[PDB]
Amino acid sequence: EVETFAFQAEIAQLMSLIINTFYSNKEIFLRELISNSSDALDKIRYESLTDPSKLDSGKELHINLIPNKQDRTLTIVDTGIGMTKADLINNLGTIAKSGTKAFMEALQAGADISMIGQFGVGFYSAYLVAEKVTVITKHNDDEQYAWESSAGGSFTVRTDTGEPMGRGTKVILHLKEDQTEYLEERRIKEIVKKHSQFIGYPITLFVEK
Numbered sequence: 485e486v487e488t489f490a491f492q493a494e495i496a497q498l499m500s501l502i503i504n505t506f507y508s509n510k511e512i513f514l515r516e517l518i519s520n521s522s523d524a525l526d527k528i529r530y531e532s533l534t535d536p537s538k539l540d541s542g543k544e545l546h547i548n549l550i551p552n553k554q555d556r557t558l559t560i561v562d563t564g565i566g567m568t569k570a571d572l573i574n575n576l577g578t579i580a581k582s583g584t585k586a587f588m589e590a591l592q593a594g595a596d597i598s599m600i601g602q603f604g605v606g607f608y609s610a611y612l613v614a615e616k617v618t619v620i621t622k623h624n625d626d627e628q629y630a631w632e633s634s635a636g637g638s639f640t641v642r643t644d645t646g647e648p649m650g651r652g653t654k655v656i657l658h659l660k661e662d663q664t665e666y667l668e669e670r671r672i673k674e675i676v677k678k679h680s681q682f683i684g685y686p687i688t689l690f691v692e693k
């Protein structure tokens with residue numbers, strides 16, 4: 485059973501701006517997603533200090549970057565805290581309203597899209613490179629869910645029947661046809677070294693041959 489939801493209007497606006505604005509420095513999407521993963525890992529790590537059983541769903545804290553040329557996907561996997569259904573449907577959109585407004589105002593006053601993370605809405609930069617984003621997530625207190633959106637004002641959420649992931653988040657970027665450079669090992673390595681070299685969790689870049 486797939487449920488379909490409308491984004492908050494301000495978030496639909498933001499996604500349209502990200503999709504429509506001419507802006508060549510698209511590579512910053514990766515830093516933003518990796519930062520989100522790091523923050524999610526920090527959260528579970530801290531909670532585990534007071535309740536060690538929170539790592540019963542997995543003790544490894546890491547980030548994997550997985551390109552797949554045949555599927556034209558780049559997947560950012562973390563074993564962080566994960567998101568609940570309420571996060572996916574309501575809470576993330578609600579908290580993002582203020583940051584989205586501030587970002588759009590800053591852009592009008594001379595900021596650029598690479599500053600998106602300063603406003604707490606860097607996830608949406610995925611739409612610089614992806615025509616569709618699928619997010620598979622599992623929080624200790626909730627079931628495994630799949631969220632998905634191709635923009636256009638709506639997103640879907642369903643319970644995920646796929647491979648159970650233990651705990652964490654997988655952001656699957658279905659890349660646009662002209663954005664396949666982000667499947668290349670030398671390109672991803674370049675970007676991680678430039679913008680994510682000090683992240684406090686192991687980042688493993690998977691390869692293909």
Ligand SMILES: COc1c(C)cnc(Cn2cc(C#CCC(C)(C)O)c3c(Cl)nc(N)nc32)c1C
Pocket residue numbers: 520521524527562564565566567571572576607619631653655
């Ligand atoms: C569903 O797609 C998203 C949307 C629509 C918005 N932002 C985000 C970014 N985001 C947000 C995370 C979170 C959370 C809730 C807590 C309480 C952990 O802050 C969160 C978490 Cl835990 N992990 C990661 N990797 N990204 C997260 C995503 C993935």
Ligand SMILES: [Mg+2]
Pocket residue numbers: 490491492495576577578
């Ligand atoms: Mg919304």
